[PDB]
RNA sequence: AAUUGAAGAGUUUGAUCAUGGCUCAGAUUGAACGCUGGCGGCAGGCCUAACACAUGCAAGUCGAACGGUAACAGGAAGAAGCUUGCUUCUUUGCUGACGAGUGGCGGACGGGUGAGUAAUGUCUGGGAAACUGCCUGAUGGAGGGGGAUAACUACUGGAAACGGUAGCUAAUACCGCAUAACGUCGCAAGACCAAAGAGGGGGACCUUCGGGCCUCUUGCCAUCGGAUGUGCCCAGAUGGGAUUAGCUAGUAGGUGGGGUAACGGCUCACCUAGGCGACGAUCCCUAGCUGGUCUGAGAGGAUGACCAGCCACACUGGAACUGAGACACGGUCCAGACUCCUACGGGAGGCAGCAGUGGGGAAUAUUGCACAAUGGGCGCAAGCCUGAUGCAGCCAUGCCGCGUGUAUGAAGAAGGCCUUCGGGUUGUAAAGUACUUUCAGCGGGGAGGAAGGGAGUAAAGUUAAUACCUUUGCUCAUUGACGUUACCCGCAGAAGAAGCACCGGCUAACUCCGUGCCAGCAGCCGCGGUAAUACGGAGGGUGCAAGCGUUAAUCGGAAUUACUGGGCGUAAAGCGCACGCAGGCGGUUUGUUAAGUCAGAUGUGAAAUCCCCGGGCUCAACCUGGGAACUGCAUCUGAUACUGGCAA
RNA sequence: GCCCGGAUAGCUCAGUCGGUAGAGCAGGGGAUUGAAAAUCCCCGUGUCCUUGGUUCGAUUCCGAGUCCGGGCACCA
C-alpha cells in the first residue's frame, strides 16, 4: 500500500500509477509514496510552490 | 549456415574418409602383433612388428600421428615381445 | 557560472566591503550598510558555529566569483599540494587569470576584468586566453590583443588602480598596457582580513 | 608469432601510439610481453614526441619479432646517422 | 525493400466509394485484371482485398484495402472503402485522399441514404471529382432503367455542390468482367481512359511546409511504427526530423524511412500514398486523426469560428430540431473528435435544413485550418456539412 | 619528492548521568523520476526476459599451386557493310584479368554476454612427465614414377533442399619406391622413417622450335634450438549456513595391460581397505574471478559497470570430425522446443556480432560514414575483406570548462508585501546612459592527424649481365570517414541563453494573508484544536547552478561486531559446579639448531589506475613521460637477543 | 479498426420492459467541554457519464462520443 501525497488526486479502481520509496509513519502499514506527475496519477491542481515534487509544471503565465 | 567457407565442411568431410581409411590400416597391423602375443609367438610377432614398423612410422610423418604415440607403440610392443624373447 | 545578480546585496549579508562595485563611486554609500541584507535584516544575528564557517566560505567565494563545485576542486587541490592547506588555497585562488587582471588594474571591478578575459582581449605570454580559470605560472607576462587595445574601458580603469593598494607579486608597465607576473602570491601580501582558517574546517566535516 | 607494433591509446582525435612487443593473436591493446617506447604522431614540434629503446628492440629482432611498417619506418626516423 | 520506386509518372489519389452490396471489392479486382494486359500486372483478387478471415464471411469492407495499379499513361493508387453505415468511418478518414474517385451503382439498388451522404462527405472531406460506374449492368433487360436512375444519379451529384451532369457514366457487369468475359472487360478499360482525361492532374502542394494526415499506423516486424497516409503538403526526405502534432501529448519524431506499397522511396513528395517509418515512437504514443507537422509549424486549437449547414430531414439527415449542448463528432480529414456546440445570440432552436452560424469549443486540440472543409456526423446519418471560419 | 591525516546533532526523563538503539548532516553511482534546460570538450550508455527475432552487413583471400574463361575489355584469324579498313561481327584462352571448381592459408584470433561453476575456475609463488602453424637461427636434403578426382559433358531424381550413375583432365591434392642423419626403437648391434615445385630476368649454348640450360626471388622436407602460445601438477589464499555430521565404493593406494602431446583411476583386470572429516568434509543457498572502483584517518567494509588479464557458454541437451590449435558464435551429425517454406513426400533456420524489432521493464542510443590511421587475414606485391577499429548521430547520464554581459545610475519611482501608515522593503535592483561581444547565428579563410605505396630515374649490392631482384636517395601526381573540421577573421545587436530546493530546531535563512485536529506537511522530534515562521498562497531571503531536488544502493557517522578500537555485580550479557581430551599459553640456568623473527640482495609482484615530479590539448576534465608504490610471495647469505625444537 | 460489461448522491448497490430516482453504510451541522468519547436536537448532500432523439412525459426505449476493464482482428 502507498500513501497518495497531494491535494485533490484523480484516481479510481484501476488507474495506473508510479511508486517511490518512503513511509509516512502515521498510517500503520504504509511504506511507499505515489509519484504525482508520473503516469496516470496526474499532478496536483494549482500549486505555485515546491512543484519539483507533485509534478506541476511552471506557470504558462 | 550459408557461408563462403562452407567448403571447409566438404573439404574436411571428404578428408575424413581418407583419414579414417589410413588410421584403420594402422591399428589393424597393431592388433596383428597382439594376436601373436596371445599365441606366444616370439618370432612371428617379430616379423609382424617388422611388418608394421614402417607402417606406424609412415603414418607418423603424414600428420596423422604425433609420432609419440607411434613411438610408444615401437616402445612397448617391442618390450612386449622381447620380454617373451 | 557567473552570479549575474545584485552585486552590492552580497556585501550586505556578508557585511563586508568586498569592492564588488568598486568603480567610479569609490565608497558605495547607497546600500544602507550592515543593517539591511533583506526585508528582516534589522534583527540581530546570533550566528552559530556552523553559521560562522559557512559565512566565512561565502565571504571568499563572493569575492573571486567562484561557484561551489569549482571551489571544492580548489580545496581538493589545496589538500594535495605541499605546504599549508588553507594557504595553498589562497595560492590557487590568487593565481587565477581574471584575479591577476584585477590586480594588474585592467578593469575597475573583478567581474569587469573577467569580461576582458572572456572576450579574447587579455593575452598572456602572447597566447590569447579566454578561460578565467586559467592558472598563472611564475615568470609570466600579460597583455592585450592589439585589436582590443585601449578602447574606452581599459584606460579609465587603469587610472583607478592608482587609487588603491598596487600589490607586490606583480607590476604593470601601464604605458603599452603591459603586465608582468613575478614570484608566487604570499599570505601576508594578500587580503589578511578574510580568513581561511574556518574554511579548511568546513570541508573537514 | 611475436610482433612489434603500435597500440593506439590516448583519446578521441588525439592518438598516442604505444610501440610494444606482443603476440600477433591478441587485440590492438591485448596481452603484450613488454613495451618498448612510444610514438606521438601529433607531437609535431615540441619538447618530446618519440622514443624507441633500440637495444631491447634488438633483443627481439634477434628472436624474430616481425616489425610492422609504421614501426619500421619510425626506426628510420630515429636514424643511427640522424 | 522491394524495387526502389521511380518518380516517372503523374499521380491521382483515386479510389472506390459507394454503398453496401454494389460490388466495389469484386470490381476493383477486375480493374487490376483489365489493366494487367495494359502495363505490368496487379490483378489483386476478391480475397486479396477482403484479406481478413472475418471479411470473407462478413463480405463487407469493415477495414479498407489499398491496392495500386498503373496505366500506360501515368501512375495511380486505388483505395477500396465501404458503403455501410456502422463501418462508414473506415471510408470517412480514407475519403480525404481522393482528388478523384469511383462511385458504384448496381441496377437493382440505385440511390441509397448512404449513397446520398457518401457524395455529401466528398466535397466536405475534399473530394470534388467523382467518376460513376453503373455496375450490375446484366441485372434487368431494361437499359432505360439504368437511364432514368442515372437522371436521379446526376441530380444526386447536382444537389450536393457537384456539376455531376458532365461525369462520364460507363455501364458494365464486373462479375463477368473479372471472370474473363472480354465483352464486359473493355468497359472498365474505357473508364480508366477517362481518368487519363476528364478529372485532371491535381495541384500538388509539395512547395509548402511539411504536413501529412495520419491514415493509420502499423507495427511492422523489425521496423516498428510505420505511420501511413499520403503527404498533404511539401516534400520530405529520410532524415527530416518533425513533430507528431494533434489531440494527444505531442512530441518530436525523426522520419527515418518512407516507402510506397513496399516500394522504397527516398525523398517523398506531397500526394503519393506512402508509409512513413518513425524513429523511436511506440504504438501507444500515436493515434488515427493526428497529423505529422514540420517542427513547430502549427500548434492545434480548440475554440474556432465556424459556418455550418444543418441538413434537412428531407435530405435524410438530422430529423428533428435541437438545444444548445448538442454533441456530434467533428471530422477534420482524419479526425474523430466530439465538438461542444455553442451557437451565439439570435438563434437557439435550429430546425433540420438551417443555414446557421456558430462557434465550437473542442474537447481537445487539433490541426485547425481557417477554411478547413469538414462534415458534421452523428451516428446513423450525416447530420451536418460545413467549414471552419477562423481560429480563436 | 612519493598516505599533511579523524568534528558531531536530534531523540527515552519533571530534571541528570549513563547504557542503548532509531534518524539526519558528507561522498559516490552503469541510476530512474519531476521541474527545468544555452554551448562546448571528454567519458558512459539493457544492471529486468541467457526472452523470442524481419532485412542488410559482421571473414575472407591467393592466377607467383592447378585444370579452366561463363563474363568484361584489348589482341589475333576471319567477316561484314560502306566514310574498304570507317564500322559490323563469328571465332580465338593468345594476353590483361576473373565467375564457378580443385588446392593452400585463414575460419580456434578478434567481437559478445555472465547462464553455469564454491573448484574441473581465478589470484599468487613454485614444479616437470609436454606440445607448439605462422616468425627466426644453424646443419643437411630437395631423385625417379604411378593411380584417381571436382570443375566439364550426357542422362536423370526432386516443388525446393539435395543430389545419383558412367566416361574426361590437372595440381604445391593423394600414393608407394629410392634415399637418409646429432631422428624414433633398442643396452647395442641392427631395424625403420620424408618431400613440391613455382615466377622473374638472360649472354652463349641448345630448340622434337612446349623447352632444357645460367641465375635471383620464394616455397617444400628433416633434426636440434630459441622465442611465443597452450596443456598439466603442487602449496597458500579464494562467499553465507552446523536448525547439513558423517561422507565416498573407480571410492584410497599398489601390480600389470591400454590410452593422452604430457603424468595420472584417465580407463580396465585382480589385490590391499583405506581416504576425506570439527584447522568444517559431504549436502544446502547465492555468485563469474582478479588487477581494480567507491567510501574510509587508517585498519577495514561493500563491490568489481567501463578498461585490461583469465575462465565459461554460443537456441536446449549430447557427441565427434577436420585441424598445429576447438570438443568450434556466423562448421558437421543426432534429439528436443520454437519459427518459416512446401507440390505435404521433406527441408531451411539460430542477433549472448554491430545496427535494428516486438515484449519485459524505473530505465538505457542509429537498420550513419570509411577502410584515411592502428591492428588482424591472405598474397611477391599492388591490393581485396574487416559493424575489429577510427569517427559521426542520439540522451545533461556523469565529470570539467565557458556563457546568459560590463561600468554607471536615486523620481532613491511604479506595482507588490509588511507597517508603530512615521516608514521600510524589493533596491544600484530596474529604467535611463556610456561601453563589450565569448558562445550561438550568418558571411570568408584554415593547421595537424599522411607514415607510406605507385610511377620513373639515379647510385650502391647481386650475377655471366649495364637484366632481374634487395637497399638508400631524388622528382612528379597525389591517397582523409571526420570535415558545412581544431583554430583564426569579419558582421551584427543587450541582442537567443536562470532556473530549482529550502527557510521550527537538527541546518544556511522570514513575516503576512487564507485554512481551523479539516485540508495537508514528515528524514527524527513532530506541527495543525480560530491569531501556524512546520499546512496552502504572496513578498522577502538562503543554498546550489545548467543544473536543482526526490527515490533507490554502498561506505561514512556507527568505538551500534570494538584486529587497530568495546563489554559481562544491578543497564544486554559469567556455563549451576567440578574433573578433564583436543586446542592455546608457560617459571629459571646452559648449550645447540635457526622453522617463526629481523637485515640485505636476488627472482617476481603484467600494463593501466592510486600517489610524486614534468610535458601536451587557450584551461580543466583528459591524454601522456619517468619514478615511486604494488603493504605480498619464493630463494639465497648472515644475526640469533625473543618464541618454538632436541639434549643436560 | 471492431465486439461486450462498468459508467446510479462519498462509497456500494436496488429500482426499467415509459409515469416527476431510493436504500445501506457514510460523514456531518448545532448544546457541554481545554477539545473530544459519550448523551440530546436535526439531518441526503443526486448533472442516474455526457449529449440528443421516438412524445402529454425517458434512470429506464434506441442510439453516438469519451473514459475504464476485458476479448479479436490489421502488419509500409
Ligand atoms: N449480377 C452481378 N453481380 C455482381 C456484379 N459485381 C459483383 N456482383 C457480386 O456482388 C456482391 C458484393 O461484393 P462487394 O464487392 O463486397 O461489394 P462492396 O460494394 O465492396 C460492399 P462494402 O460497401 O461493404 O464495401 C458479391 O456477391 C459479388 O460477386 C455485377 O456486375 N453483376
Ligand atoms: C504502404 O503500402 C503505404 N505506402 C500505403 C498505405 C497502405 C495502407 C494504408 C495506408 C497507406
How do the domains of chain D map onto residue ranges? Answer: 1-81
Alpha carbon E35 to its chain centroid, in Å, reads 23
Chains adjacent to E (≥3 CB pairs closer than 8 angstroms): none
Contacts of C71 (CB under 8 A, 6+ apart): C61
CA of D23 to C1' of F192 (A): 39
Contacts of E336 (CB under 8 A, 6+ apart): E89, E92, E93, E288, E289, E329
Alpha carbon E37 to its chain centroid, in Å, reads 28
Contact E256, E238 (CB under 8 A): yes
Backbone angles phi, psi at E67, to 5 degrees: -130, 135
Ligand 2 centroid to Cα of residue E218, in Å, is 9
Contact E305, E390 (CB under 8 A): yes
E138 annotated to bind ligand: yes
- Per the DSSP assignment, residues forming a β-bridge with D15 are D10
Contact E244, E250 (CB under 8 A): yes
Q: Which nucleotide is closest to E219, CA to C1'?
A: G75
Residue nearest to nucleotide F229 (CA to C1'): D23
What is the spatial distance between Cα E245 and Cα E255, in angstroms, rounded to a whole number? 14
Q: Which of E16, E20, E23 to mutate to test the pocket of ligand 1 (most atoms within 8 A of CB)?
A: E23
Residue nearest to nucleotide G68 (CA to C1'): A14
E21 annotated to bind ligand: yes
Helix, strand, coil content of chain A in percent (nearest 5): 5, 15, 80
Q: Which of residues 360-389 of E touch strand G (CB under 7 A)?
A: 363, 378-380
The secondary element (H helix, E strand) that includes residue C113 is: helix C110-118
CATH no. of C94-181: 3.10.290.10
Contacts of C157 (CB under 8 A, 6+ apart): C105, C106, C107, C108, C112
Query: What secondary structure letter does DSSP report for E311?
Result: P
Atom 13 (ligand 1) nearest CA: E23
E23 annotated to bind ligand: yes
What is the spatial distance between Cα C23 and Cα A55, in angstroms, rounded to a whole number? 45
Any strand G atom closer than 7 Å to E63 CB: yes
Any strand F atom closer than 7 Å to C23 CB: yes
Q: Which CATH architecture has domain C7-93+190-203?
A: Orthogonal Bundle (1.10)
Q: Where in chain C is the domain with CATH 1.10.1050.10?
A: 7-93+190-203
Q: Whose CA is closest to E102, among E212, E186, E24?
A: E24
Helix spans in E45-196 (H): 46-49, 54-57, 88-95, 113-125, 143-159, 174-178, 182-195
What is the spatial distance between Cα C203 and Cα C61, in angstroms, rounded to a whole number? 14
Query: What secondary structure letter does DSSP report for B4?
Result: G
Burial of E346 (0-12, 13-18, 19+ CB in 10 A): exposed
Calculated CA dihedral for residues E171, E174, E180, E181, nearest 10 degrees: -30
HEC letters along E117-137: HHHHHHHHHCCCEEEEEECCH
Residue nearest to nucleotide F368 (CA to C1'): E239
Contact C143, C155 (CB under 8 A): no
Chains adjacent to A (≥3 CB pairs closer than 8 angstroms): none
Q: Where in chain C is the domain with CATH 3.10.290.10?
A: 94-181
Active site residues of E: 21, 24-25, 84
Resolution of the experimentally solved model in angstroms: 3.6
Any idea which ligand is nearest the CA of E218? Answer: 2
Method used experimentally:
cryo-EM
Contact E183, E144 (CB under 8 A): no
Structural domain that includes position B11: 1-85
Any strand G atom closer than 7 Å to E279 CB: no
SS3 E25: helix
What is the spatial distance between Cα E10 and Cα E73, in angstroms, rounded to a whole number? 8
Backbone angles phi, psi at E352, to 5 degrees: -60, 120
What is the spatial distance between Cα D77 and Cα D65, in angstroms, rounded to a whole number? 19
Number of domains in chain B: 1
What is the spatial distance between Cα E20 and Cα E5, in angstroms, rounded to a whole number? 34
Q: In Å, how far are C82, C118, D30, E269 from D25, measured between CA atoms?
A: 47, 52, 9, 53
Length of chain C: 205
Contact C107, C122 (CB under 8 A): no
CA of C71 to C1' of F447 (A): 36
What is the spatial distance between Cα E369 and Cα E366, in angstroms, rounded to a whole number? 10
Q: In Å, how far are B34, C178, E242, E296 from E209, measured between CA atoms?
A: 94, 57, 11, 11
Q: In b/e form, how buried is each residue of C54-80, taking b as 16+ CB within 10 angstroms?
A: ebbbebbbbbbbbeeeebeebbeebee
Q: Which of residues 21-80 of B touch strand F (CB under 7 A)?
A: 22-23, 30, 50, 53-54, 57-58, 60-64, 66-80
For residue E225, what is its C-alpha cell?
Answer: 511504427
Q: Look at strands A19-21 and A32-34 and give their pairing.
A: antiparallel
Q: Where are the beta strands (DSSP E) in C90-166?
A: 122-124, 127-128, 141-144
Helix spans in chain B (H): 7-37, 44-61, 68-84
Query: What secondary structure letter does DSSP report for D74?
Result: H
Query: What secondary structure letter does DSSP report for E158?
Result: H
Contact E291, E253 (CB under 8 A): no
Amino acid at each position: 500500500t502507498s500513501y497518495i501525497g497531494g491535494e485533490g488526486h484523480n484516481l479510481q479502481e484501476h488507474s495506473v500509477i508510479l511508486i517511490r520509496g518512503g513511509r509516512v509513519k502515521d498510517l500503520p502499514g504504509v511504506r511507499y509514496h505515489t509519484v504525482r506527475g508520473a503516469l496516470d496519477c496526474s499532478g496536483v491542481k494549482d500549486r505555485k510552490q515546491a512543484r519539483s515534487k507533485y509534478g506541476v509544471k511552471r506557470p504558462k503565465a | 549456415n550459408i557461408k563462403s567457407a562452407k567448403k571447409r565442411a566438404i573439404q574436411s568431410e571428404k578428408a575424413r574418409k581418407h583419414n579414417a581409411s589410413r588410421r584403420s590400416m594402422m591399428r589393424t597391423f597393431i592388433k596383428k602383433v597382439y594376436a601373436a602375443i596371445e599365441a606366444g609367438d616370439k618370432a612371428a610377432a617379430q616379423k609382424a612388428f617388422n611388418e608394421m614398423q614402417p607402417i606406424v612410422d609412415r603414418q607418423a610423418a603424414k600428420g596423422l600421428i604425433h609420432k609419440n604415440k607411434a613411438a610408444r607403440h615401437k616402445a612397448n610392443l617391442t618390450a612386449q615381445i622381447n620380454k617373451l624373447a | 557560472a557567473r552570479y549575474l545578480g545584485p552585486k552590492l546585496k552580497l556585501s550586505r549579508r556578508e557585511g563586508t566591503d568586498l569592492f564588488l562595485k568598486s568603480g567610479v563611486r569609490a565608497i558605495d554609500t547607497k546600500c544602507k550598510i550592515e543593517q539591511a541584507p533583506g526585508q528582516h535584516g534589522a534583527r540581530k544575528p546570533r550566528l552559530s558555529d556552523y553559521g560562522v564557517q559557512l559565512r566565512e566560505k561565502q565571504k571568499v567565494r563572493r569575492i573571486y566569483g567562484v561557484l561551489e563545485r569549482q571551489f571544492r576542486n580548489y580545496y581538493k587541490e589545496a589538500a594535495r599540494l605541499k605546504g599549508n592547506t588553507g594557504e595553498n588555497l589562497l595560492a590557487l585562488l590568487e593565481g587565477r587569470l581574471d584575479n591577476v587582471v584585477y590586480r594588474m588594474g585592467f578593469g575597475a571591478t573583478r567581474a569587469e576584468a573577467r569580461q576582458l578575459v572572456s572576450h579574447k582581449a587579455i593575452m598572456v605570454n602572447g597566447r590569447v586566453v579566454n578561460i578565467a580559470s586559467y592558472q598563472v605560472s611564475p615568470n609570466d607576462v600579460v597583455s592585450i590583443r592589439e585589436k582590443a587595445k585601449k578602447q574606452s574601458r581599459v584606460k579609465a580603469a587603469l587610472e583607478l588602480a592608482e587609487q588603491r593598494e598596487k600589490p607586490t607579486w606583480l607590476e604593470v608597465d601601464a604605458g603599452k598596457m603591459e603586465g608582468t607576473f613575478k614570484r608566487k602570491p604570499e599570505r601576508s601580501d594578500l587580503s589578511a582580513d578574510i580568513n581561511e582558517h574556518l574554511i579548511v574546517e568546513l570541508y573537514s566535516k | 608469432m611475436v610482433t612489434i607494433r603500435l597500440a593506439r591509446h590516448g583519446a578521441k582525435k588525439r592518438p598516442f601510439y604505444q610501440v610494444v612487443v606482443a603476440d600477433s593473436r591478441n587485440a590492438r591493446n591485448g596481452r603484450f610481453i613488454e613495451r618498448v617506447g612510444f610514438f606521438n604522431p601529433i607531437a609535431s614540434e615540441k619538447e618530446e614526441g618519440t622514443r624507441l629503446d633500440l637495444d631491447r628492440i634488438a633483443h627481439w629482432v634477434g628472436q624474430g619479432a616481425t616489425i610492422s611498417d609504421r614501426v619500421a619506418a619510425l626506426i628510420k626516423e630515429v636514424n643511427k646517422a640522424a | 525493400s522491394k524495387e526502389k520506386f521511380e518518380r516517372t509518372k503523374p499521380h491521382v489519389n483515386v479510389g472506390t466509394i459507394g454503398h453496401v452490396d454494389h460490388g466495389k471489392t469484386t470490381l476493383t479486382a477486375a480493374i487490376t485484371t483489365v489493366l494487367a494486359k495494359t502495363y505490368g500486372g496487379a490483378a489483386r483478387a476478391f480475397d486479396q482485398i477482403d484479406n481478413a478471415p472475418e471479411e470473407k464471411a462478413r463480405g463487407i469492407t469493415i477495414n479498407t484495402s489499398h491496392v495500386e495499379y498503373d496505366t500506360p499513361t501515368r501512375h495511380y493508387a486505388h483505395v477500396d472503402c465501404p458503403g455501410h453505415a456502422d463501418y462508414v468511418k473506415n471510408m470517412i478518414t480514407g475519403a480525404a485522399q481522393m482528388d478523384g474517385a469511383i462511385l458504384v451503382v448496381a441496377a437493382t439498388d440505385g440511390p441509397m441514404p448512404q449513397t446520398r451522404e457518401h457524395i455529401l462527405l466528398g466535397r466536405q472531406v475534399g473530394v470534388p471529382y467523382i467518376i460513376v460506374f453503373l455496375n450490375k449492368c446484366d441485372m434487368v433487360d431494361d437499359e432505360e432503367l439504368l437511364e432514368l436512375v442515372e437522371m436521379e444519379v446526376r441530380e444526386l451529384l447536382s444537389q450536393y455542390d457537384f456539376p455531376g451532369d458532365d461525369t462520364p457514366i460507363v455501364r458494365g457487369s464486373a462479375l463477368k468482367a473479372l471472370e474473363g468475359d472480354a465483352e464486359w472487360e473493355a468497359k472498365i478499360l474505357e473508364l480508366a481512359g477517362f481518368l487519363d482525361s476528364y478529372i485532371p492532374e491535381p495541384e500538388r502542394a509539395i512547395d509548402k511546409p511539411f504536413l501529412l494526415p495520419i491514415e493509420d499506423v502499423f507495427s511492422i516486424s523489425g521496423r516498428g511504427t510505420v505511420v501511413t497516409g499520403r503527404v498533404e503538403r511539401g516534400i520530405i526526405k529520410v532524415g527530416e526530423e518533425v513533430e507528431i502534432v494533434g489531440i494527444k501529448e505531442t512530441q518530436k519524431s525523426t522520419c527515418t524511412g518512407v516507402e510506397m506499397f513496399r516500394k522504397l522511396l527516398d525523398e517523398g513528395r506531397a500526394g503519393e500514398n506512402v508509409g512513413v517509418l518513425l524513429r523511436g515512437i511506440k504504438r501507444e504514443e500515436i493515434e488515427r486523426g493526428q497529423v505529422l507537422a514540420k517542427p513547430g509549424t502549427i500548434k492545434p486549437h480548440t475554440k474556432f469560428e465556424s459556418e455550418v449547414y444543418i441538413l434537412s430531414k428531407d435530405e435524410g439527415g438530422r430529423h428533428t430540431p435541437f438545444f444548445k449542448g448538442y454533441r456530434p463528432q467533428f471530422y477534420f480529414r482524419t479526425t474523430d473528435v466530439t465538438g461542444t456546440i455553442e451557437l451565439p445570440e439570435g438563434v437557439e432552436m435550429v430546425m433540420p435544413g438551417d443555414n446557421i452560424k456558430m462557434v465550437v469549443t473542442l474537447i481537445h486540440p487539433i490541426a485547425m485550418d481557417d477554411g478547413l472543409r469538414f462534415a458534421i456526423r452523428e451516428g446513423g446519418r450525416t447530420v451536418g456539412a460545413g467549414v471552419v471560419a477562423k481560429v480563436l
